[PDB]
Write a protein that holds these residues in place. Sequence first.
Motif, short mmCIF file in Angstrom:
data_model
loop_
_atom_site.label_atom_id
_atom_site.label_comp_id
_atom_site.label_asym_id
_atom_site.label_seq_id
_atom_site.Cartn_x
_atom_site.Cartn_y
_atom_site.Cartn_z
N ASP A 66 0.84 -1.19 0.00
CA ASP A 66 0.00 0.00 0.00
C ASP A 66 0.88 1.25 0.00
OD1 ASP A 66 -2.35 -1.55 0.14
OD2 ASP A 66 -2.55 -1.33 2.28
N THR A 67 0.47 2.25 -0.76
CA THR A 67 1.15 3.53 -0.84
C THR A 67 0.90 4.38 0.42
OG1 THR A 67 -0.73 4.55 -1.99
CG2 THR A 67 0.87 3.45 -3.33
N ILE A 68 1.75 5.40 0.60
CA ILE A 68 1.52 6.29 1.73
C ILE A 68 0.19 7.01 1.55
CG2 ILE A 68 2.45 8.25 3.06
CD1 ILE A 68 4.01 5.53 3.32
N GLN B 211 -8.37 8.90 6.94
CA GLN B 211 -9.58 9.69 6.74
C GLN B 211 -10.85 8.86 6.95
OE1 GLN B 211 -10.44 11.11 2.76
NE2 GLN B 211 -11.21 13.11 3.45
N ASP B 212 -10.88 7.60 6.49
CA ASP B 212 -12.10 6.82 6.67
C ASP B 212 -12.47 6.62 8.14
OD1 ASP B 212 -12.58 6.58 3.94
OD2 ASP B 212 -11.55 4.64 3.74
N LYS B 213 -11.51 6.70 9.06
CA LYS B 213 -11.75 6.45 10.48
C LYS B 213 -11.77 7.70 11.35
CE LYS B 213 -10.75 1.69 11.46
NZ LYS B 213 -10.18 0.82 12.51
N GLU B 214 -11.01 8.74 11.00
CA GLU B 214 -10.90 9.93 11.83
C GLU B 214 -11.44 11.20 11.20
OE1 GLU B 214 -7.32 10.49 14.16
OE2 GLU B 214 -6.50 8.63 13.31
N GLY B 215 -11.77 11.18 9.90
CA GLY B 215 -12.30 12.34 9.21
C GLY B 215 -11.28 13.38 8.75
N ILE B 216 -9.98 13.17 8.97
CA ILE B 216 -8.94 14.13 8.55
C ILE B 216 -8.60 14.00 7.06
CG2 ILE B 216 -6.66 15.07 9.02
CD1 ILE B 216 -8.45 15.15 11.46
N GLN C 200 -2.53 15.73 6.41
CA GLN C 200 -1.87 14.67 7.15
C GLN C 200 -0.37 14.63 6.85
OE1 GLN C 200 -3.68 10.78 7.04
NE2 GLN C 200 -5.68 11.60 6.52
N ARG C 201 0.44 14.46 7.90
CA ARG C 201 1.87 14.16 7.78
C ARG C 201 2.17 12.98 8.69
NH1 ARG C 201 0.50 18.51 8.47
NH2 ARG C 201 -0.08 19.45 6.43
N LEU D 291 -0.59 16.82 12.69
CA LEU D 291 -1.47 17.83 12.10
C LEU D 291 -0.93 19.22 12.39
CD1 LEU D 291 -4.77 16.00 13.27
CD2 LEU D 291 -3.58 15.89 11.07
N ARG D 292 -1.33 20.20 11.59
CA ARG D 292 -0.95 21.59 11.83
C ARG D 292 -2.01 22.24 12.73
NH1 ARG D 292 2.04 25.81 8.96
NH2 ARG D 292 1.19 27.89 9.50
N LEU D 293 -1.65 22.52 13.99
CA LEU D 293 -2.58 23.18 14.93
C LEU D 293 -2.21 24.62 15.24
CD1 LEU D 293 -2.98 20.31 17.56
CD2 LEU D 293 -4.44 20.78 15.54
N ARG D 294 -1.12 25.15 14.70
CA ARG D 294 -0.70 26.48 15.15
C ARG D 294 -1.63 27.59 14.65
NH1 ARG D 294 4.94 25.90 11.87
NH2 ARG D 294 4.20 23.72 12.18
N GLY D 295 -1.83 28.62 15.47
CA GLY D 295 -2.54 29.80 15.00
C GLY D 295 -2.35 30.98 15.94
#
Lengths: 178, 78
Positions: free
Chosen positions: B23-25, B33-38, B43-44, B73-77
């Motif tokens: 399987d590819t990355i 995504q199918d399990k967490e919705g991201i 995604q990294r 994930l990117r959470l900065r703001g």
Amino acid sequence: SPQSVFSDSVSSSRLELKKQIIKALDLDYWQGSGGEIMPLVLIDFYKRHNININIYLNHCKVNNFDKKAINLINAGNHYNALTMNSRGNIERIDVPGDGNCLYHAVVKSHQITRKPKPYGNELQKDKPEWCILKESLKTHFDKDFDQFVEQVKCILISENTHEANKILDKVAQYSGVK
Amino acid sequence: GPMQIFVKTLTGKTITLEVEPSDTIENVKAKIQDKEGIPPDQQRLIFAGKQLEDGRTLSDYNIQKESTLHLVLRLRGX
């Protein structure tokens, strides 16, 4: 007269190395790695005081609101708060667009629902609530640093810069890679 | 032969996936995504000190049964 009996929880040069790493990560600069660290420290500090934090990214479906949690939205490199109105609404409460929007958004969410506060005391009543929270989080990161090292590594790897790679070398030495 | 791997976010949320060495990355990102919705473009993934790249397979990185990948994930703001 001299010390004959010893027990030591930590090394002196190891503590200095930790202090140099915290300073280089620059937690007051939200655009770099420090801005990824402070939301993780926020969630953990709140959890330890039995309060849940939930963060929503961009425009998302928002399947089930948890009204008993601190709810935040990060869309467009900015934090605001979320709350429910008119028996089902979900509304966004704006906070100043300065570098401290994360701590303003948490304070604003405590104010709108009177949700219990895990920070602060009467000795700091001359100090703004958002400042007391931010400084409580930096203290927590410093004292439980060893619990965030794996996360700090992954954040630095994912940034892919010369600046982050030099810090990653100091983290690897701290974790004991030889 | 399908194998079990874990995907842990930096907040400690862990999920289980079943994957194939080939399987590819980017396919692994679709399963997350199918399990967490991201969405995949948020995604990294990190494993053994390396960021996993689209266009490569799990086998390229010698990912084995019961391996743990780290989701950033990117959470900065702000």
